[PDB]
Write an enzyme that holds these catalytic residues in place. Structure first.
Site, short mmCIF file in Angstrom:
data_model
loop_
_atom_site.label_atom_id
_atom_site.label_comp_id
_atom_site.label_asym_id
_atom_site.label_seq_id
_atom_site.Cartn_x
_atom_site.Cartn_y
_atom_site.Cartn_z
N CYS A 120 6.60 37.43 60.52
CA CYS A 120 7.53 37.22 61.63
C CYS A 120 8.20 38.55 61.95
CB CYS A 120 8.56 36.16 61.27
SG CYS A 120 9.55 35.59 62.67
N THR A 162 16.40 11.88 69.20
CA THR A 162 15.54 10.93 69.88
C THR A 162 14.28 11.61 70.42
N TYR A 163 13.38 10.80 70.99
CA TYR A 163 12.13 11.31 71.54
C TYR A 163 11.88 10.90 72.98
N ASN A 164 12.66 9.96 73.53
CA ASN A 164 12.58 9.58 74.94
C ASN A 164 11.18 9.14 75.35
N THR A 165 10.43 10.04 75.99
CA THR A 165 9.15 9.69 76.59
C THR A 165 8.17 9.16 75.55
N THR A 177 11.59 4.81 69.91
CA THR A 177 11.43 6.22 69.56
C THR A 177 11.75 6.48 68.09
N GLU A 220 10.63 18.01 74.68
CA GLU A 220 9.90 17.06 73.86
C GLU A 220 8.96 17.75 72.88
OE1 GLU A 220 11.54 14.08 74.31
OE2 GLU A 220 12.34 15.76 75.47
#
Ligand code: ZN
Lengths: 303, 73, 313
Positions: C62, C212-215, C219, C284
């Site tokens: 890195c 959360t993940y929504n779509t 979720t 997402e």
């Protein structure tokens, strides 16, 4: 002599009281898991100044450090740890580190003499004693472990040697406590070995078989030998003359005091180191002094 | 009660400086100190005396804002 | 733009710190953890902590954390001569390279013999309180090194490594999951040896585990899948999960992406990033590429604490 009773306001047994370097402050601890600091006033009165909680086990021996490093304390408790509490400017005490290395409860912790830097020694119930050091003086949080010794027996007390000369190498005394009927010695002497940079085995007091309950070295102030004290069921005073590996010593016995008819719990010397003090299960404090011919005798009984 | 345009004049400062010097001649040190408190609290433009500050030997910088430890390094 | 993998317009609509700002809670928690770990006074010195960060970031190549960290190590009283290499380093961190190996490549070979040799008497010895900080530091830096490449963020080394051709092995004495868990066993030990570090690690772990993940076509199922799959990659096997849902709940593109990120983060490309789930929004793909560092850190901490606990039992 007169006494002035002080309202402890503790919830359990007080274990130790230790005095400041300048004699105006004193610190207390107890098995109620706390540490309090009292300062004297203009009218010779004592009042509290700080009542904070330190550990989560029964708090044993609490010590003061030289004010050249600041107003920094130390403590050990049933928690297998050791702290380096410090007061900062109203004012309050804030923790600086927590040495957590022993698998058994830490019994005693004693600061080293000034002339060897800032050090700290702790004895553990399983028989391991360890020396720490803080080379960066201005931040009391970079503590390091330098030496580790095995005592082959339980450890109960520790005492440094305050000899400031450069003809005496630093040495540390270890007080055992095991009561198992197998005879064997309790007190042992460990001596620095700057040639090899390690602590060695210097001498072992063979005449001590009963459990040792407190130990102390006498302040030197100019003496050419070493004086030791032991808090067994009797009070004993030893004398150690170095002859011109570790140095070879000559171990003599000076006092065999047995007028407590009890078990002696503590021992404490003076500043000039000419008078001794001790307390036993009988309940009073005795003072012992030399009658100018290596013949000690009692000089007071305080109760 | 002066808005910050009159106090900036080269004339309104000369009178104060000359009065302060006259107070120095009196050897009325403490009266001058009190007048300085007054002027400073009623005139932001005045810059107090330029004096010495001490500097560290390792950091090299000033200490003016552990207590024993320097705040620089 | 901060990244060549995410469009600049997307970042504006929604130097690498600003990228993580799209999540408020985790940004706050990570910043708190970083502040306590690397800046506050503690058992070790600041220069040594920066050196530890350097050696733990010079493991995934890195070239972002092996930068500023060496750029702020010098400004904290450090020795400029040390950067010549570990051969120039004092004989106090030389004991740390062997354990730095597996904490970034192959965690499963840790055991009592490794920590014991580290806690060995001599002229250069560690204490518990001053090596538990070191291992937490190493894990944090490995996780950051994984995440930075996981977002492909746009802003010598080989003289800092021992045997730099080690790499990560696929895998096949497994680690049973609910035999030594963080919420019951490990938390007590880390708290006892390191009180504030335990609380900050705890807050980070629950903050990451509440996102959360929504779509989605509930979720939580895809969360559990992406949470346990990375764990079984490392060797911890949860018996309760039915592992058909692992293959039936994540596209092979997602699986190859997460393995490439967590194993060989230098191998990810823009084509590799975009080849999975083009019909979504980048946050997402960030909330998924951003929990893998947390799972990696959890697994590493659990393995290390299991190694250390046996040394006292
Ligand atoms: Zn300075």
């Amino acid at each position: 002599f007169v006494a002035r009773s002080i309202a402890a306001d503790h919830k359990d047994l007080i274990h130790d009281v230790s005095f400041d370097f300048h004699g105006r402050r004193m610190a207390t601890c107890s098995s109620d898991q706390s540490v309090k600091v009292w300062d004297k006033s203009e009218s010779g009165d004592w009042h509290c100044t700080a009542s904070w909680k330190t550990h989560s086990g029964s708090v044993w021996r609490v010590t003061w450090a030289h004010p050249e490093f600041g107003q920094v304390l130390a403590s050990c408790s049933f928690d297998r740890t050791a702290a380096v509490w410090e007061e900062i400017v109203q004012s309050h005490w804030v923790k600086r580190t927590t040495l957590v290395d022993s698998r058994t409860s830490v019994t005693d912790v004693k600061f080293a003499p000034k002339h060897m830097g800032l050090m700290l020694a702790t004895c553990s119930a399983d028989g391991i004693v360890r020396i720490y050091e803080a080379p960066d003086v201005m931040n009391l949080s970079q503590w390091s472990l330098q030496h580790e010794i095995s005592c082959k027996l339980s450890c109960s007390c520790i005492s440094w040697n305050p000899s400031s000369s450069r003809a005496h190498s630093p040495m540390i005394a270890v007080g055992s406590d095991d009561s198992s009927p197998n005879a064997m010695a309790k007190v042992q002497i460990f001596e620095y070995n700057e040639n090899t940079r390690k602590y060695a085995k210097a001498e072992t007091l063979m005449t001590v078989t009963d459990p040792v309950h407190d130990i102390a070295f006498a302040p030197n102030l100019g003496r050419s030998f070493h004086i030791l004290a032991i808090a067994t069921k009797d009070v004993r005073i030893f004398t150690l003359k170095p002859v011109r590996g570790p140095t070879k010593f000559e171990i003599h016995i000076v006092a065999q005091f047995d007028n407590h008819n009890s078990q002696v719990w503590r021992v404490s010397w003076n500043i000039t180191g000419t008078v001794l003090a001790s307390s036993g299960d009988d309940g009073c404090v005795r003072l012992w002094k030399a009658n100018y011919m290596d013949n000690w005798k009692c000089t007071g009984i305080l109760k | 009660g002066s808005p910050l345009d009159v106090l900036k004049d080269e004339r309104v400062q000369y009178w104060i400086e000359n009065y302060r010097n006259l107070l120095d001649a009196w050897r009325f040190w403490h009266k001058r100190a009190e007048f300085d408190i007054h002027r400073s609290k009623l005139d932001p433009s005045s810059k107090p005396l330029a004096q010495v500050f001490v500097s560290c030997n390792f950091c090299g910088k000033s200490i003016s804002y552990k207590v024993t430890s320097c705040p620089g390094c | 733009g901060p990244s060549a993998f995410i469009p600049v317009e997307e970042v504006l609509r929604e130097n690498l710190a600003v990228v993580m700002g799209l999540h408020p809670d985790y940004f706050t928690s990570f910043w708190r953890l970083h502040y306590l770990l690397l800046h506050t006074d503690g058992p070790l010195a600041s220069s040594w902590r920066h050196y530890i960060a350097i050696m733990a970031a010079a493991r995934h190549q890195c070239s972002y954390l092996v930068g500023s960290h060496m750029a702020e190590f010098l400004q904290t009283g450090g020795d400029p001569e040390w950067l010549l290499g570990l051969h120039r380093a004092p004989e106090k961190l030389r004991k740390l390279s062997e354990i730095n190996k597996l904490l970034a490549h192959r965690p499963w070979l840790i055991t009592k013999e490794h920590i014991q040799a580290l806690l060995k008497t001599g002229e250069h010895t560690w204490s518990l309180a001053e090596l538990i900080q070191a291992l937490v530091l190493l894990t944090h830096c490995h996780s950051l090194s994984s995440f930075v490449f996981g977002c492909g963020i746009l802003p010598d080394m080989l003289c800092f490594v021992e045997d730099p051709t080690f790499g990560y092995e696929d895998f096949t004495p497994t680690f049973r999951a609910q035999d030594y868990t963080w919420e019951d066993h490990g938390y007590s030990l880390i708290q006892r040896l390191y009180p504030e570090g335990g609380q900050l690690l705890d807050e980070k772990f629950q903050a990451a585990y509440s996102l959360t993940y929504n779509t989605i076509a509930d979720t939580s199922v895809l969360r559990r899948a992406i949470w346990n799959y990375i764990h079984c990659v490392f060797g911890i096997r949860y018996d309760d999960y039915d592992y058909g849902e692992v293959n039936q709940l994540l596209e092979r593109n997602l699986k190859v992406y997460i393995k490439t990120v967590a194993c060989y983060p230098e191998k990810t490309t823009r084509r590799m990033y975009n080849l999975f789930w083009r019909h979504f929004r980048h946050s997402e793909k960030v909330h998924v590429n951003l929990l893998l560092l947390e799972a990696r850190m959890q697994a590493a901490l659990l393995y290390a604490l299991r190694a250390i606990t046996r040394y006292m039992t």
